Ligand binder design. Sequence first.
Ligand SMILES: Cc1cc2nc3c(=O)[nH]c(=O)nc-3n(C[C@H](O)[C@H](O)[C@H](O)COP(=O)(O)O)c2cc1C
Ligand SMILES: Cc1cc2nc3c(=O)[nH]c(=O)nc-3n(C[C@H](O)[C@H](O)[C@H](O)COP(=O)(O)O)c2cc1C
Lengths: 171, 171
Amino acid sequence: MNMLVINGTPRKHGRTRIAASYIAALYHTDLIDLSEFVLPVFNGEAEQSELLKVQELKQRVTKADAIVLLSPEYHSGMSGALKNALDFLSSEQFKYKPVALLAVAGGGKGGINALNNMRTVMRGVYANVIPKQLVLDPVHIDVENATVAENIKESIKELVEELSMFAKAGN
Amino acid sequence: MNMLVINGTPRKHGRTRIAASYIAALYHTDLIDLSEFVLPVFNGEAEQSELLKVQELKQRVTKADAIVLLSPEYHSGMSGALKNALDFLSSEQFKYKPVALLAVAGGGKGGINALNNMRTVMRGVYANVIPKQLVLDPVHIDVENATVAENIKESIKELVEELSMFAKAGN
Ligand SMILES: Cc1cc2nc3c(=O)[nH]c(=O)nc-3n(C[C@H](O)[C@H](O)[C@H](O)COP(=O)(O)O)c2cc1C
Ligand SMILES: Cc1cc2nc3c(=O)[nH]c(=O)nc-3n(C[C@H](O)[C@H](O)[C@H](O)COP(=O)(O)O)c2cc1C
């Protein structure tokens, strides 16, 4: 079970980091934190494909057999940071690969548009997004303790468990 | 009538540039071409808000009284380049401002997801997206002549005309 987790939040001090950091640790996964893994804004130039960064991304993303894609909802969407990232990839690295969506909003009814966005894009690169999805609000993140609240743990378990299921049935 | 046009395509050799470049010229508008206007991937740091670039963006975007937002559909979405841009802004600069969406796909049924994406995000910053929207395929862009095909001109006229209408009724 070679799993990958991508923290779409560019902000190093962002809650999504905490969530992503919790999941990766609890499941011993690869982890691409867009706070550290900084890429340049895509520009189509193939001399950009030869960039330090970029080759590793395709490499790690294609290595994984299942992915947990996290991102904060920014202006009812996924982060520009994560979209830019994805623009470098294609259905080459994602085709038929299991993906679990998870968004980090700021409360209220925020978070679904971030999810539909991701879901649509993922389907754009032909991935296999599992049904169960999840949105984590601030009440689900314990900043002071740099980890997630108890109330949401069971949900994350079920998410990762449905991912694993699909990712296995694959073969 | 102070209008602004934003070419969401990062690629300098991209078709969206041609379209955006045509519209801006035909209507004497401001123009932010994301091929030249390169920003860094957002990161939340306020020391990024003091970046050369960033201050001008908010400035020009808030100056405009109507905006024609163009972008190519990348992985069924708007470009990471343009989303990143928008992440720097907020409902501060967009509230109630008229926006016309226009996407540049590669043919087939591509282009609507790019539009819904933008439409949702725009609504996120409280803008006033006009009803009429438009998708331009390759058959609508005359690359060799660095301009748009005749078949699509009337459509662009109607688009910009509905924008102006709304942008005026505003007051
Ligand atoms: C530019 C910007 C736009 C945002 N837009 C939304 C939004 O549309 N809906 C929402 O629920 N939260 C929004 N947020 C709040 C984030 O979802 C919230 O910060 C969350 O804790 C994720 O934080 P992170 O991006 O630092 O990980 C936005 C935050 C920023 C900085
Ligand atoms: C990473 C990437 C992803 C793309 N995804 C789509 C897509 O989902 N649907 C589509 O109709 N075209 C897609 N295209 C093609 C562009 O829409 C097409 O190039 C168009 O001419 C706009 O070109 P431009 O981005 O250079 O302006 C994609 C192109 C690239 C480079």
